[PDB]
């Protein structure tokens, strides 16, 4: 098995960047690496094939160089519709194999997340399930930490995560944690509270109720 | 034009059996080798089999081989993948891709073009409709002019559901976050939305949440609590 490993594995730049991704394989392979374009939820499209030919109808401002071992694609002047995940892929020996991608992101300026909580709907305590959401909303970069603290106890591994893609209009991100536990357990405990930290906070920003809005 | 339309998708229990279809159209399909390709939820592109243009030739991936089996019917411009006993790994969307010259040109293969992908979830969990729950922001709060409120769309399967806000009407600040699996085999799913703090109580919010695989539909105000 031929391996490809891309770097970076994600990147932000700007409409009119010059940007670089380079694809690094295991084993010699001359010129049989080929680079894919995909967006969220589409197929992949052939960007460039035999390391450096340009497929038809793929703009100029796409290319690649590089044999061997060591390949690169080049934007060279980044536009909006190139935002997007980049894939390299040998064809020098079967299996075939792919890189593990390369996310070009939008670059802008930091931004501190809105953090809000949510107590668990009566609706919900019925089924015998309490969920408790905490929303991190529009910050900038994607990097962040959640703390789940319950009765001032910090929580790991009752809790999952989802992130958005770039908002189309500004650019950011935003976040939805929730912690999930029992009807029962939830009745047990008072205090609920999620603390963040993000490079656009001075200190961790946290949101707490108490149970039965006390 | 080049047409690969991919059929075939769905729920598979573990172990069982199913098969994918992608028909072309718009190049002659008997003098091209065609590759499926698969890609987990948020994984990269993985490469699953390749069959020659007479079908003599098949080789896989090393974690498919042994139970997929490729094949095609030249005669209806049909590729086709084999999936028996299939596991939770194999959850993925497949792509079939044409190469991009004739099996006999010897060039450097790559995938020119693709089909549009079907999805298979490998899962026992049974289909059901999701319970929806109000994210509701507190009436006392006086942190901001600004309030989030959101739905909780909670325990269904399969994916996907659809969230609007107010039928489509509140598009300003909307933010449906990708959906979580859950260790039940359930998914979980939250939208919220931002908006103005002094319009809780007096502008009505409306989450429509649809989920096809059950016909359901469910309409839930969001109100302030307290």
């Known amino acids: 098995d031929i391996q490809l490993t891309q770097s970076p594995s994600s990147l932000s730049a700007s409409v009119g960047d010059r940007v670089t991704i380079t694809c690094r394989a295991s084993?010699?392979?001359?010129?049989?690496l080929n680079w894919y374009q995909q967006k969220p939820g589409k197929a992949p499209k052939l960007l460039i094939y035999?390391?450096?030919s340009l497929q038809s109808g793929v703009p100029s401002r796409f290319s690649g160089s590089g044999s061997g071992t060591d390949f690169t694609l080049t934007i060279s002047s980044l536009q909006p519709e190139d935002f997007a995940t980049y894939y390299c892929?040998?064809?020098?020996?079967?299996?075939?194999?792919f890189g593990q991608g390369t996310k070009v992101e939008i670059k802008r300026t930091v931004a501190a997340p809105s953090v809000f909580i949510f107590p668990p709907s009566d609706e919900q305590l019925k089924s015998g399930t309490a969920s408790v959401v905490c929303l991190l909303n529009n910050f900038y970069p994607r990097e962040a930490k959640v703390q789940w603290k319950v009765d001032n106890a910090l929580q790991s591994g009752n809790s999952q995560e989802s992130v958005t893609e770039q908002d189309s209009k500004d650019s950011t991100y935003s976040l939805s944690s929730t912690l999930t536990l029992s009807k029962a357990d939830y009745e047990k405990h008072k205090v609920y509270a999620c603390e963040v930290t993000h490079q656009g906070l001075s200190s961790p920003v946290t949101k707490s109720f108490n149970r039965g809005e006390c | 034009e080049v047409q690969l339309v991919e059929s075939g998708g769905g729920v598979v229990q573990p172990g069982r059996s199913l098969r994918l279809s992608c028909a072309a159209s718009?190049?002659?399909?008997?003098?091209?080798?065609m590759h499926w390709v698969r890609q987990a939820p948020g994984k990269g592109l993985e490469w699953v089999a390749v069959?020659?243009?007479?079908?003599?030739?098949?080789y896989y991936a090393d974690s498919v081989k042994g139970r997929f089996t490729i094949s095609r019917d030249n005669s209806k411009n049909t590729l086709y993948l084999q999936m028996n006993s299939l596991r939770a790994e194999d959850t993925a969307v497949y792509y079939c891709?044409?190469?991009?010259?004739?099996?006999?040109?010897?060039?450097?293969?790559?995938?020119?073009?693709w089909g549009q992908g079907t999805l298979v979830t490998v899962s026992s969990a049974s289909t059901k409709g999701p319970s929806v729950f109000p994210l509701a922001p507190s009436s006392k709060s006086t942190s901001g002019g600004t309030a989030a409120l959101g739905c909780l769309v909670k325990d269904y399967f399969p994916e996907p559901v659809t969230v609007s806000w107010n039928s489509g009407a509140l598009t300003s600040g909307v933010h449906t976050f990708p959906a979580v699996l859950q260790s039940s085999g359930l998914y979980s799913l939250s939208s919220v939305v931002t908006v103005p703090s002094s319009s809780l109580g007096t502008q009505t919010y409306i989450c429509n949440v649809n989920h096809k695989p059950s016909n359901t539909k469910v309409d839930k105000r969001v109100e302030p609590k307290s």
């Open positions: 035999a390391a450096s």
């Open positions: 891709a044409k190469e991009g010259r004739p099996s006999d040109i010897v060039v450097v293969v790559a995938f020119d073009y």
């Open positions: 892929q040998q064809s020098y020996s079967t299996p075939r194999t």
């Open positions: 084993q010699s392979i001359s010129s049989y």
């Open positions: 718009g190049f002659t399909f008997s003098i091209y080798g």
């Open positions: 069959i020659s243009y007479d079908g003599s030739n098949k």
